[PDB]
Design a binder for this molecule. Structure first.
Ligand SMILES: CCCCCCCCCCCCCC(=O)O[C@@H](CO)COC(=O)CCCCCCCC
Ligand SMILES: CCCCCCCCCCCCCC(=O)O[C@@H](CO)COC(=O)CCCCCCCC
Ligand SMILES: CCCCCCCCCCCCCC(=O)O[C@@H](CO)COC(=O)CCCCCCCC
Ligand SMILES: CCCCCCCCCCCCCC(=O)O[C@@H](CO)COC(=O)CCCCCCCC
Ligand SMILES: CCCCCCCCCO
Ligand SMILES: CCCCCCCCCO
Ligand SMILES: CCCCCCCCCO
Ligand SMILES: CCCCCCCCCO
Ligand SMILES: [K+]
Ligand SMILES: [K+]
Ligand SMILES: [K+]
Ligand SMILES: [K+]
Lengths: 106, 103, 103, 103, 103, 106
């Protein structure tokens, strides 16, 4: 079963900065990585599918990149509403698994 | 009206049906199984095409008993449908050559 | 009574026999060999099916001389049996078309 | 003048065209895609040959929707062209045997 | 005397020759090349068999231009030889069925 | 995306010596490595393609070797005009990537 490592577990940035979350898979999984955002008391929300593809209604400052084992979710110019926990999820092999999450602090 | 052409057309539509059903059933069969990769429908249709043509890259394949049985159905349907097309082409050529020599 | 259909049926039963014997003999041939993966009978039957159809995923294959010779027998039996089915389909189509045009 | 031979020759030239166009279009389709390997024209022509013959080593394959659709066109063109050659060989043999027995 | 059977036999002996020559020439072509695996004659003959049958496991394959051109010759010779056997089987069935119905 | 590691970042040799630059790929890429030389204020110049193949007009003291993940650019008898930055570049997988460069000092 594929371990997804999200490190560091907390990222601290200043408003307007570009930030990058890391997700490393324990084996090669092509681009079958998906990213979710979960705010305090909220349900998870899909941000990026298949490592880099946009979702309708997600602000354009969100992007994703990587393939194989190394994946990055990036935010251009962080702002306050981006304060949340961020999870990656793989669908390359059964069962689907989740990363342990990165908290964004401003 | 000619039998060979209608059988070719039938085989084509049957093959499309088998590719779609094989995609659905391969996902159904493989999601139980740790390590399985044949578990989402878009790539399962791709896998079913490569299985039906025998053009098999090795990027996807079933690991369960029932996924492999689905695979066998797709293989035989593909090989049989293309063999049927070959046989119809031969029947057409044989008829046209009987005409060209006036028989 | 028609030769092509009886030969097709014979080839089918012969192919089933070859798949079973090839599974048994591939395991027999490969267990001597460090690194060999074609060494338990359920997956060896799966391997023999993919070899007989030429739908060859790359998940299993022989590494020994005798396992590869077994493989060659399974390949030729598979290709020949499916080619025989094609040839019988063509004979059926050719006969039916001779009838449809009244010859 | 014989239909089967002219169709075989046509299929050969069409296949060459499909291999070249498939090489070009596979590169065009795959360079958008992280991890894609089917992205330079010399190896893409090699890939198109293995796809057209169903002799598919697993060294290269498309990962995008449009590269896979290109792949399907190359598969069907290859299988159909070789099946057409088979059908023409059968028509030639059938005619020569009708002559050898004086019909 | 029948053309189809003699052509089948010719194709068989030609295929054996092509497998041996392809083994020799594939080794000759690939030993220049860092990373190449198709570089000793016993496994190169195995590779040539899998290429000629299109039963292609992915355990070996050429990486050079000239090894790939050798590969293409082996592919076409294999596909053509087996297609020729199919065509001869069809000619035999067609003749026997013409007899069985008294024509 | 394939990381190409060029270490050490600076190589110091005496004239007439044989020197070797290292390029390590983060995954196996056959021989799809190409080497470029960039002098001060100059544009990059291809030296070696596909890990070992010569380019017309490049002095014969330049050679390349390796396959898989480990690649070496070698210079027989270094001379002054060889003072430059040297980059490797992979074309095995999309996107093409560059190594970070090795400077040659005499
Ligand atoms: C009832 C169960 C469904 C059974 C059939 C499912 C069909 C799935 C739709 C296929 C298109 C997916 C849309 C998409 O953007 O797919 C891309 C994902 O981003 C990649 O597509 C793919 O990579 C695979 C598509 C290969 C198609 C082969 C052509 C067959 C003649
Ligand atoms: C005399 C030597 C024996 C030669 C033949 C051996 C036959 C073995 C029985 C096959 C079923 C195994 C039962 C089982 O639960 O298998 C699963 C194991 O948990 C996985 O099955 C498998 O993964 C492989 C089965 C693939 C079958 C292909 C269909 C062929 C038309
Ligand atoms: C319009 C888009 C172009 C579409 C076709 C492109 C053709 C590319 C030229 C092919 C030769 C490359 C020259 C060279 O030195 O190639 C070597 C690279 O060093 C390795 O060659 C190769 O490894 C692949 C060649 C395989 C050829 C298969 C034979 C097909 C009947
Ligand atoms: C002129 C150049 C030579 C061209 C042909 C070379 C033929 C080589 C002899 C093959 C037997 C090797 C003896 C041996 O013990 O091989 C084993 C090595 O320990 C493994 O065998 C092997 O693994 C490969 C043999 C596969 C044979 C496929 C059958 C083809 C109908
Ligand atoms: C024709 C093959 C039947 C498909 C079986 C579905 C898989 C059930 C797994 O429990
Ligand atoms: C027809 C192939 C014969 C099978 C040989 C069995 C393997 C014996 C290995 O010592
Ligand atoms: C016949 C297949 C059409 C090829 C499509 C080219 C790829 C476009 C990707 O945006
Ligand atoms: C028919 C293919 C010719 C074989 C060429 C031999 C390889 C020479 C490599 O320099
Ligand atoms: K095949
Ligand atoms: K294959
Ligand atoms: K493989
Ligand atoms: K065939």
């Amino acid at each position: 079963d594929i371990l997804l490592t999200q490190s560091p577990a907390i990222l601290s940035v200043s408003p307007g900065e570009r930030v990058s979350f890391s997700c490393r898979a324990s084996q090669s999984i092509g681009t079958d990585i998906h990213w979710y955002q979960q705010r305090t008391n909220g349900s998870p929300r899909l941000l990026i599918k298949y490592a880099s593809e946009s979702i309708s209604g997600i602000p354009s400052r969100f992007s994703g990149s990587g393939s194989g084992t190394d994946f990055t979710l990036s935010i251009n110019s962080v702002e306050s509403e981006d304060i949340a926990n961020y999870y990656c999820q793989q669908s390359n092999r059964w069962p689907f698994t989740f990363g342990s999450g990165t908290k964004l602090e401003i | 009206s000619a039998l060979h052409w209608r059988a070719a057309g039938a085989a084509t539509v049957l093959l499309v049906i088998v590719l779609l059903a094989g995609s659905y059933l391969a996902v159904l069969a493989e999601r139980g199984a740790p390590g399985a990769q044949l578990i989402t429908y878009p790539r399962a249709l791709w896998w079913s095409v490569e299985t039906a043509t025998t053009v098999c890259y090795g990027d996807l394949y079933p690991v369960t008993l029932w996924g492999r049985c689905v695979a066998v159905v797709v293989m035989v349907a593909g090989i049989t449908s293309f063999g049927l097309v070959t046989a119809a082409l031969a029947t057409w050529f044989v008829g046209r050559e009987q005409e060209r020599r006036g028989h």
